[PDB]
Amino acid sequence: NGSQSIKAEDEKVVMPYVLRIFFGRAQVPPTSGQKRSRKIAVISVLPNFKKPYINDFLSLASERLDYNYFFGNSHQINSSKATLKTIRRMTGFVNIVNSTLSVLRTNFPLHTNSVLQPLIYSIAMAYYVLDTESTEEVHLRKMASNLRQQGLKCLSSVFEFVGNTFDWSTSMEDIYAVVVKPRISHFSDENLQQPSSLLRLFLYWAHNPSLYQFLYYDEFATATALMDTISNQHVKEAVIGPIIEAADSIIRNPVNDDHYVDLVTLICTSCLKILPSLYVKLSDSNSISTFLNLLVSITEMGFIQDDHVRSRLISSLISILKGKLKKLQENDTQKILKILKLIVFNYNCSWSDIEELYTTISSLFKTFDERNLRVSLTELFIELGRKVPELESISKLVADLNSYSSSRMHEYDFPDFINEKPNLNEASKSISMLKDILLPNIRIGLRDSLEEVVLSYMVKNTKYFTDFEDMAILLYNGDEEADRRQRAIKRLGEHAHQLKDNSISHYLIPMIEHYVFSDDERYRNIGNETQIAIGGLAQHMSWNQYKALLRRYISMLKTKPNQMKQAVQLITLRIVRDGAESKLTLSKFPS
């Protein structure tokens, strides 16, 4: 008969709204008691009478789900629903602790709340009943103790009711009457917030606009309290950033920066949070990261600091200038952030950024020589913008070489901090050399020569565009250096980049031989570069299977010579992974 009544519900829509409201009115007239319970509360209730009431709430749920647009709603059905919900609350909170009929009437009450939320799920902007405050005060006096009750990952009876009441136009009258956002913000600022906290945050972010478009001054102060909740909930959207739904945070922070500027410490906290929005997770997308940096700039245009947020915005621009993502949109937002950071370093940054980012002109090569002849003492964002131009951004090749040489000149004129800046230059040149670049690899080689300012002739002859006598002199220089972990790793990386699967050129056997000779000359340095030799042999072993295995086989055979010389010298090690790699070679032998 459940399947039969489900068929009756699936065919219970064929009659008009008059007959649907008449059948709903007959369903309401079972145990309404509007003479007894339309004033305040009910007169009496029973277990089987609540079972008629639980069945009435279930029939209301089935009727609303069947006719989930119109539902034939009536104030008699509303009064019967309020009488049933109040009788469920009264019986559950007035019965003794025996829990059988109490859990029956509690699962009657949760299902009745689900059927009540179904009415607003079906007929939301259709009725908007003007006597809402009766049921609103009834449900408030029932669920006053539901302060932090709806704070969970699945608690969505009163949380969904609050979201429905907040996502309307004029049904927020019961919200702005006394309180909805107070208890919602209490459970939102609860510290054990699960991932419905983002749902409540998006609901309040969408519901601040109705409280702002409302002409009532009470709703204006409630919108002020929603901005105050956005300022007092400065840990929830931080700690709940476990998914890629950071567009809600970027949509609230832009709304907050466009709406309310209430404290300089609040603007500094917003700028530091949007700095953590780019220094917290690397999976933030382009529009979200651009709007987050623009919201940090919008808080900084109002109430920024002069030293602390100055350095924070300078670090933000020093990351965003190395990024420059999304076809110069992030570069334009980074130039705006550097012009809003309000320092002397930021002033030189905005000058040397606007003088180069003038919409694809020769002003980039003009401004590189301009700041070279007029070298600025900030130099951090200058080295960022001149190392993005030294990377695979095609123009400013000689200007990139002059920028690296001028950074070396400043690092020699310092004579400590600018040597740690040269450490960052070397840690950038390492990832530049281990890459598929053509102009930026030559620029990193020029930076290696400027850091080297026999060895200088070797570097300039490795970057000589000749490659036959040049590679012969490189092999002879490796022989002279044989007769350095990261340094020889960088040299062998540049050599492997110049001979990296370029099988349209000859002497690849001597090129791999020079790679293995530099690897042997690094592996002779056992006290330092044994780890680097192990890493280079490991990367060559990964390349021995990664889609190409002709010259990598000879690289494996000639990197075995370091092991042969080490075993002849030993005449303790790690035999285990060596034997397992021997088993892997035996498996590659059965290919």
Binding site: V13, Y67, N68, Y69
Partner: protein
């Protein structure tokens, strides 16, 4: 039907002198029950133990599926206009699998007006049938084996995919 065996016919080499055998039980070809429109009558035939097979002949209540949301709802049958597994099958107006048959789409109107409010994002050449009532939909289920008429609606790409044909 007759048979399922290669013994009555020639292979990929061209052989002769067949004269093979009295045909067994397990070469059982039943008669082709061309399912039509009528009053719902399904013959419950037996095979392979208690393997009842529903052979539908006059089925109506097609469960056809709204595509973009996957809403299989109940409707009637009108007639198949194009099915060149037999071009006389559409002349005789039967109902087999993978046929394109017409449906009075009034419960789909009810579901759209029930879970969207207003009446009429969806394509225009099926919005014309949203207005008129008869939409094209293709049968998925097998009434000759499973006895049922299920199907999927035509929505856009598959619609024009058949409308350019016929």
């Amino acid at each position: 039907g007759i048979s399922r065996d290669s013994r009555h016919k020639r292979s990929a080499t061209g052989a002769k002198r067949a004269q093979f055998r009295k045909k067994r039980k397990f070469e059982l070809g039943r008669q082709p029950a061309n399912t039509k429109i009528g009053a719902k009558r399904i013959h419950s035939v037996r095979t392979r133990g208690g393997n009842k097979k529903y052979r539908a002949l006059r089925i109506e209540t097609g469960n056809f599926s709204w595509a973009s949301e996957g809403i299989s709802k109940k409707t009637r049958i009108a007639g198949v206009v194009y099915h060149p597994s037999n071009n006389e099958l559409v002349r005789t107006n039967t109902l087999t699998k993978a046929a394109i048959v017409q449906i009075d789409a009034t419960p789909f109107r009810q579901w759209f007006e029930a879970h969207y409010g207003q009446t009429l994002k969806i394509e225009s050449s099926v919005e014309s049938q949203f207005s008129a009532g008869r939409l094209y939909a293709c049968i998925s289920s097998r009434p000759g084996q499973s006895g049922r008429c299920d199907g999927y609606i035509l929505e856009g790409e598959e619609l024009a995919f058949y409308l350019r044909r016929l």
